[PDB]
Design an enzyme around this catalytic site. Structure first.
Site, PDB file in Angstrom:
ATOM      1  CG  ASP A 132      -5.668   7.370   3.484  1.00  0.00           C
ATOM      2  OD1 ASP A 132      -6.059   7.322   4.640  1.00  0.00           O
ATOM      3  OD2 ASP A 132      -4.708   7.930   3.171  1.00  0.00           O
ATOM      4  CG  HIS A 157      -1.109  13.112   8.189  1.00  0.00           C
ATOM      5  ND1 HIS A 157      -1.490  13.675   6.929  1.00  0.00           N
ATOM      6  CD2 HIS A 157      -0.503  12.068   7.904  1.00  0.00           C
ATOM      7  CE1 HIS A 157      -1.088  13.174   5.895  1.00  0.00           C
ATOM      8  NE2 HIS A 157      -0.364  11.906   6.390  1.00  0.00           N
ATOM      9  CE  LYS A 168      -4.037   9.727   6.242  1.00  0.00           C
ATOM     10  NZ  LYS A 168      -4.100  10.136   4.788  1.00  0.00           N
ATOM     11  CE1 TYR A 174      -0.893  12.429   2.256  1.00  0.00           C
ATOM     12  CE2 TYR A 174      -2.772  11.101   1.522  1.00  0.00           C
ATOM     13  CZ  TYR A 174      -1.931  11.234   2.237  1.00  0.00           C
ATOM     14  OH  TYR A 174      -1.458  10.372   3.195  1.00  0.00           O
TER      15      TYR A 174
HETATM   16  N1  LIG Z   1      -0.488   8.424   7.243  1.00  0.00           N
HETATM   17  C1  LIG Z   1       0.489   8.817   6.590  1.00  0.00           C
HETATM   18  O1  LIG Z   1       1.508   9.392   6.785  1.00  0.00           O
HETATM   19  C2  LIG Z   1       0.829   7.958   5.164  1.00  0.00           C
HETATM   20  C3  LIG Z   1       2.119   7.896   4.582  1.00  0.00           C
HETATM   21  C4  LIG Z   1       2.190   7.402   3.490  1.00  0.00           C
HETATM   22  C5  LIG Z   1       1.174   6.871   2.725  1.00  0.00           C
HETATM   23  N2  LIG Z   1      -0.170   6.992   3.368  1.00  0.00           N
HETATM   24  C6  LIG Z   1      -1.510   6.523   2.483  1.00  0.00           C
HETATM   25  O2  LIG Z   1      -1.266   5.353   2.185  1.00  0.00           O
HETATM   26  C7  LIG Z   1      -1.405   5.238   0.515  1.00  0.00           C
HETATM   27  C8  LIG Z   1      -0.523   3.985   0.007  1.00  0.00           C
HETATM   28  O3  LIG Z   1       0.856   4.274   0.470  1.00  0.00           O
HETATM   29  P1  LIG Z   1       1.942   4.902  -0.947  1.00  0.00           P
HETATM   30  O4  LIG Z   1       1.277   5.866  -1.788  1.00  0.00           O
HETATM   31  O5  LIG Z   1       2.891   5.435  -0.097  1.00  0.00           O
HETATM   32  O6  LIG Z   1       2.320   3.865  -1.581  1.00  0.00           O
HETATM   33  P2  LIG Z   1       1.873   2.249  -2.186  1.00  0.00           P
HETATM   34  O7  LIG Z   1       0.372   2.264  -2.035  1.00  0.00           O
HETATM   35  O8  LIG Z   1       2.648   1.222  -1.492  1.00  0.00           O
HETATM   36  O9  LIG Z   1       2.313   2.448  -3.953  1.00  0.00           O
HETATM   37  C9  LIG Z   1       1.664   2.923  -4.485  1.00  0.00           C
HETATM   38  C10 LIG Z   1       2.803   2.703  -5.845  1.00  0.00           C
HETATM   39  O10 LIG Z   1       2.661   1.340  -6.225  1.00  0.00           O
HETATM   40  C11 LIG Z   1       2.105   1.318  -7.769  1.00  0.00           C
HETATM   41  N3  LIG Z   1       1.103   0.311  -7.805  1.00  0.00           N
HETATM   42  C12 LIG Z   1      -0.044   0.310  -7.319  1.00  0.00           C
HETATM   43  N4  LIG Z   1      -0.834  -0.928  -7.639  1.00  0.00           N
HETATM   44  C13 LIG Z   1       0.307  -1.409  -8.373  1.00  0.00           C
HETATM   45  C14 LIG Z   1       0.121  -2.778  -9.054  1.00  0.00           C
HETATM   46  N5  LIG Z   1      -0.986  -3.428  -8.784  1.00  0.00           N
HETATM   47  N6  LIG Z   1       1.092  -3.297  -9.524  1.00  0.00           N
HETATM   48  C15 LIG Z   1       2.280  -2.632  -9.650  1.00  0.00           C
HETATM   49  N7  LIG Z   1       2.441  -1.424  -9.186  1.00  0.00           N
HETATM   50  C16 LIG Z   1       1.377  -0.531  -8.484  1.00  0.00           C
HETATM   51  C17 LIG Z   1       1.521   2.802  -7.846  1.00  0.00           C
HETATM   52  O11 LIG Z   1       1.808   2.962  -9.343  1.00  0.00           O
HETATM   53  P3  LIG Z   1       0.653   4.114 -10.195  1.00  0.00           P
HETATM   54  O12 LIG Z   1      -0.078   4.852  -9.269  1.00  0.00           O
HETATM   55  O13 LIG Z   1       1.509   4.557 -11.236  1.00  0.00           O
HETATM   56  O14 LIG Z   1      -0.607   2.908 -10.877  1.00  0.00           O
HETATM   57  C18 LIG Z   1       2.604   3.790  -7.062  1.00  0.00           C
HETATM   58  O15 LIG Z   1       3.682   4.097  -7.618  1.00  0.00           O
HETATM   59  C19 LIG Z   1      -0.763   6.649   0.209  1.00  0.00           C
HETATM   60  O16 LIG Z   1      -1.393   7.021  -0.979  1.00  0.00           O
HETATM   61  C20 LIG Z   1      -1.842   7.200   1.236  1.00  0.00           C
HETATM   62  O17 LIG Z   1      -3.067   7.446   1.070  1.00  0.00           O
HETATM   63  C21 LIG Z   1      -0.304   7.500   4.585  1.00  0.00           C
HETATM   64  O1  LIG Z   2       2.539  12.121   5.282  1.00  0.00           O
HETATM   65  C1  LIG Z   2       2.095  11.706   4.384  1.00  0.00           C
HETATM   66  O2  LIG Z   2       1.108  10.909   4.372  1.00  0.00           O
HETATM   67  C2  LIG Z   2       3.394  11.013   3.548  1.00  0.00           C
HETATM   68  C3  LIG Z   2       4.235  11.958   3.187  1.00  0.00           C
HETATM   69  N1  LIG Z   2       5.472  11.589   3.757  1.00  0.00           N
HETATM   70  N2  LIG Z   2       6.235  12.593   3.944  1.00  0.00           N
HETATM   71  C4  LIG Z   2       7.628  12.121   4.615  1.00  0.00           C
HETATM   72  C5  LIG Z   2       7.200  12.501   6.063  1.00  0.00           C
HETATM   73  N3  LIG Z   2       7.928  12.329   7.118  1.00  0.00           N
HETATM   74  C6  LIG Z   2       7.543  12.854   8.290  1.00  0.00           C
HETATM   75  C7  LIG Z   2       7.979  12.728   9.724  1.00  0.00           C
HETATM   76  C8  LIG Z   2       7.439  13.497  10.490  1.00  0.00           C
HETATM   77  C9  LIG Z   2       8.088  13.315  11.998  1.00  0.00           C
HETATM   78  F1  LIG Z   2       6.849  12.870  12.746  1.00  0.00           F
HETATM   79  F2  LIG Z   2       8.746  12.428  12.066  1.00  0.00           F
HETATM   80  F3  LIG Z   2       8.615  14.682  12.473  1.00  0.00           F
HETATM   81  C10 LIG Z   2       6.490  14.165  10.357  1.00  0.00           C
HETATM   82  C11 LIG Z   2       5.930  14.599   9.202  1.00  0.00           C
HETATM   83  C12 LIG Z   2       6.389  13.725   7.998  1.00  0.00           C
HETATM   84  S1  LIG Z   2       6.298  13.649   6.555  1.00  0.00           S
HETATM   85  C13 LIG Z   2       6.362  13.802   3.386  1.00  0.00           C
HETATM   86  O3  LIG Z   2       7.413  14.702   3.191  1.00  0.00           O
HETATM   87  C14 LIG Z   2       5.221  14.196   2.551  1.00  0.00           C
HETATM   88  C15 LIG Z   2       5.363  15.389   1.894  1.00  0.00           C
HETATM   89  C16 LIG Z   2       3.983  15.710   1.266  1.00  0.00           C
HETATM   90  C17 LIG Z   2       3.135  14.927   1.403  1.00  0.00           C
HETATM   91  C18 LIG Z   2       2.978  13.901   1.978  1.00  0.00           C
HETATM   92  C19 LIG Z   2       4.232  13.198   2.428  1.00  0.00           C
END
Ligand SMILES: NC(=O)c1ccc[n+]([C@@H]2O[C@H](COP(=O)([O-])OP(=O)(O)OC[C@H]3O[C@@H](n4cnc5c(N)ncnc54)[C@H](OP(=O)(O)O)[C@@H]3O)[C@@H](O)[C@H]2O)c1
Ligand SMILES: O=C(O)Cc1nn(Cc2nc3cc(C(F)(F)F)ccc3s2)c(=O)c2ccccc12
Length: 314
Positions: A42, A109, A76, A47
């Site tokens: 992903d 996104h 995204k 990022y």
């Molecule tokens: N579409 C969107 O707006 C959006 C928003 C947020 C996230 N995302 C996507 O979803 C992904 C996952 O969410 P996230 O990055 O927010 O956080 P997460 O996956 O919930 O948590 C990652 C955190 O957990 C730690 N960790 C991972 N595996 C672990 C394990 N087995 N035991 C203990 N700690 C562990 C990682 O540490 P280390 O890396 O130091 O090992 C990092 O600090 C993102 O990277 C991104 O690709 C998308």
């Molecule tokens: O986006 C990522 O994947 C993780 C992510 N989350 N956020 C929190 C956010 N909160 C939002 C709320 C809105 C809103 F729609 F609500 F206006 C729009 C956009 C965002 S970004 C961040 O600020 C961010 C900054 C850099 C890279 C990744 C991220």
């Protein structure tokens, strides 16, 4: 280990997240991930590490550890590119950085359009994000063209609430339905309403932050810790698994895709070892009972956007 999308393609239910993965460490993290079995990555332009992700993917393709068809690569469209005329260029930059000639899935996104420019979060003098006058339906049409041009095999959305999903579904002249809605989801934010809506429309849901994103830069020490929840630890212990493994297996058993992030090779491997066990039905309902409507991912400066998604119940 894969779920059928409404575009006819199969998506691996486990992927590697890359938000906050340092650019100097993410190449090795993705190489390790593909070596241990991950086939879904992903990504996002925002990022700021897609070039380095791309290095990893390309090297594993070159080494014939995997072939392109076995990978499922997701990226995204960032908020500053919602204008109809910018969407293709944003996609080709992502493709260029990832050294790919197509994406398996490209997501809008966030539903909120921001002013185009070099800034990811353009602000006005008093700090509010500067919106763009783009609506999600025109943006959607521009995404549909990417399918027709062969740049992406599927398109979808992220952080859309059910009224915004419904808007696309009801788009006059809708050509491709969204395949995926990627949203925040974990035992403190269980999203039963939105998930049921999406699945009932045959939209696959991907759960992000499944571990609660403890490395999110705006974390506060008062903030709960899923990984340290003793109730979740007891359920893990019952299964001889770690708390992370339970947190990853949980969305899988609700028919979700889940994308835990790690740059730690031991944890990348650990997180993949989730197909050798199952949570009981009761385990599942118990985990659901911990819902707090606690959302870890959003942002104040965007609260007055017309398209801000979290004012709605779901
Ligand atoms: N579409 C969107 O707006 C959006 C928003 C947020 C996230 N995302 C996507 O979803 C992904 C996952 O969410 P996230 O990055 O927010 O956080 P997460 O996956 O919930 O948590 C990652 C955190 O957990 C730690 N960790 C991972 N595996 C672990 C394990 N087995 N035991 C203990 N700690 C562990 C990682 O540490 P280390 O890396 O130091 O090992 C990092 O600090 C993102 O990277 C991104 O690709 C998308
Ligand atoms: O986006 C990522 O994947 C993780 C992510 N989350 N956020 C929190 C956010 N909160 C939002 C709320 C809105 C809103 F729609 F609500 F206006 C729009 C956009 C965002 S970004 C961040 O600020 C961010 C900054 C850099 C890279 C990744 C991220």
């Amino acid at each position: 280990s894969r779920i059928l999308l409404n575009n006819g393609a199969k998506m691996p239910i486990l992927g590697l997240g890359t938000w906050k993965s340092p650019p100097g460490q993410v190449t090795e993290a993705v190489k390790v991930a593909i070596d241990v079995g991950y086939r879904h990555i992903d990504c996002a332009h925002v990022y700021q590490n897609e070039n380095e992700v791309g290095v990893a993917i390309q090297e594993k393709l070159r080494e014939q550890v995997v072939k392109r068809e076995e990978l499922f690569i997701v990226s995204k469209l960032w908020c500053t590119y919602h204008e109809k005329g910018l969407v293709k260029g944003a996609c080709q930059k992502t493709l260029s950085d990832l050294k790919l000639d197509y994406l398996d899935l490209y997501l809008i996104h966030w539903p909120t359009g921001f002013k185009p420019g070099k800034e990811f979060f353009p602000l006005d003098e008093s700090g509010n994000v500067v919106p763009s006058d783009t609506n999600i339906l025109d943006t959607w049409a521009a995404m549909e063209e990417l399918v027709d041009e062969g740049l992406v095999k599927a398109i979808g959305i992220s952080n859309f609430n059910h009224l915004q999903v419904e808007m696309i579904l009801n788009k006059p002249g809708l050509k491709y339905k969204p395949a995926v809605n990627q949203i925040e989801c974990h035992p403190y934010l269980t999203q039963e309403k939105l998930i049921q809506y999406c699945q009932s429309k045959g939209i696959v849901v991907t759960a992000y932050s499944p571990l609660g994103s403890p490395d999110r830069p705006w974390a506060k020490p008062e903030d709960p810790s899923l990984l340290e929840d003793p109730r979740i630890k007891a359920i893990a212990a019952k299964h001889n698994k770690t708390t992370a493994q339970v947190l990853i297996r949980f969305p899988m058993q609700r028919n979700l895709v889940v994308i835990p992030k790690s740059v730690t090779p031991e944890r990348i491997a650990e997180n993949f070892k989730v197909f050798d066990f199952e949570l009981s039905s009761q385990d599942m309902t118990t985990l659901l009972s911990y819902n707090r409507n606690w959302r870890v991912c959003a942002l104040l400066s965007c609260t007055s956007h017309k398209d801000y998604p979290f004012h709605e119940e779901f």
